[PDB]
Design a protein around this ligand. Sequence first.
Ligand SMILES: O=c1[nH]c(=O)c2[nH+]cn([C@@H]3O[C@H](COP(=O)(O)O)[C@@H](O)[C@H]3O)c2[nH]1
Ligand SMILES: O=c1[nH]c(=O)c2[nH+]cn([C@@H]3O[C@H](COP(=O)(O)O)[C@@H](O)[C@H]3O)c2[nH]1
Ligand SMILES: [Mg+2]
Ligand SMILES: [Mg+2]
Lengths: 214, 216
Amino acid sequence: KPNFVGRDADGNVTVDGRSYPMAESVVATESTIHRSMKEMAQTLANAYKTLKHRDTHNKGNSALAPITDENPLIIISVLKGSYIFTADMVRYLGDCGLPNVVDFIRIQVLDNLRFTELTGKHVLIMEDIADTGRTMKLLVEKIRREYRPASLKVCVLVDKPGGRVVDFKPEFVCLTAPTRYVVGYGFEVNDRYRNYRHVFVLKPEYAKRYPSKL
Amino acid sequence: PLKPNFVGRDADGNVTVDGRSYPMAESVVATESTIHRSMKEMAQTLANAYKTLKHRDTHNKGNSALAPITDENPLIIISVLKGSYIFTADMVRYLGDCGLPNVVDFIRITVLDNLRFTELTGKHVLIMEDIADTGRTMKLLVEKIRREYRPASLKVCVLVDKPGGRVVDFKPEFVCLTAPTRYVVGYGFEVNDRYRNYRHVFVLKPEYAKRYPSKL
Ligand SMILES: O=c1[nH]c(=O)c2[nH+]cn([C@@H]3O[C@H](COP(=O)(O)O)[C@@H](O)[C@H]3O)c2[nH]1
Ligand SMILES: O=c1[nH]c(=O)c2[nH+]cn([C@@H]3O[C@H](COP(=O)(O)O)[C@@H](O)[C@H]3O)c2[nH]1
Ligand SMILES: [Mg+2]
Ligand SMILES: [Mg+2]
């Protein structure tokens, strides 16, 4: 399970024998990424499994209902960067027995949510990264104003505390990284390297490597 | 994921996989290790099919010759939301193991959310879908992509094929698993979004089909 990190004949970063010429260094290997996400899953389960919110399964019941398959935790995943993080995370949530459903928002909102009944529900946002915090600050503001959830929290895979310049603080953080551009496991440069299993610091000379439009 | 899973039954007669009870399941179509074995082999099948192909160079618009599939001009993967995102997340990582450079864009059809990629003409495009049942949705999807963009090639990779349910004539080029003509749940498949995050694919109990009628 542990991934071997080294260097090849050239100066290139290697992980399990495969060379990553775009990488300056490794932020976290896949085994490290999944271990923290498994622990975050237990953290999320402990924080939500006993909570109660509005019963929309049985609308004739005025009492708050526990988090079950009938009234699951609402997870909002931020495309495109969070879909791999989200796919792994909700599987670990199932391992911890926390019922949840996922809808996607794409961000300026490009693709709106299709879920409509978030009022008085516990809602969790799954985002790939929090750097300056501007994106998630406005997203949290918009969801609070338009949907009025019972609670609204944010779970990020990577937090860059050194970059925060607005009043935003994610409740749940898997990994903490420096203020460098990272790629891999959802992170990309013009959509490249998104499917890599590890998170790397990108070489600065690769930052403008693909200027052409997709 | 590739660890052997034990299928059993608890004292209540409910399906269990690795000791975990699944009251909504009538039977098991494929456990997680079966799922991931077929995906890894399918990724090698995908890599062998696309590795040596060439398509139009959009990285360098000054170039006139066709270009190989590289980071500069990767394979274009269109993932169909919502059912395909878990399948897609695992698949593109297996494709990286095989060294097939690819980029993913999402489309949501009933079209509710359109592609943001705009340079698909003369490109090799692979649609990644959860399941092909009656085939009407994929048939209309393939025809829409062909007419609007005219890619160099357009093929469909589905996690599950239900060939016994065909209404129209549609054959996905790549099929990881086949299922009986039943309603399936788990690993992307759901009833009103429930059970999507399960690691195995089960046949749903008919009594669970209408279990969650309320709008999310
Ligand atoms: O590949 C990447 N490596 C990074 O280090 C990084 N930091 C920020 N982002 C992207 O910028 C968007 C805005 O994030 P903030 O509003 O929190 O600053 C984020 O939503 C991200 O999409 C990154 N993408
Ligand atoms: O949970 C599910 N279990 C199933 O057996 C099933 N069969 C079809 N579908 C869904 O129907 C949509 C259209 O597929 P077809 O046009 O091929 O029938 C597909 O895209 C699927 O979303 C299923 N969903
Ligand atoms: Mg249930
Ligand atoms: Mg579908």
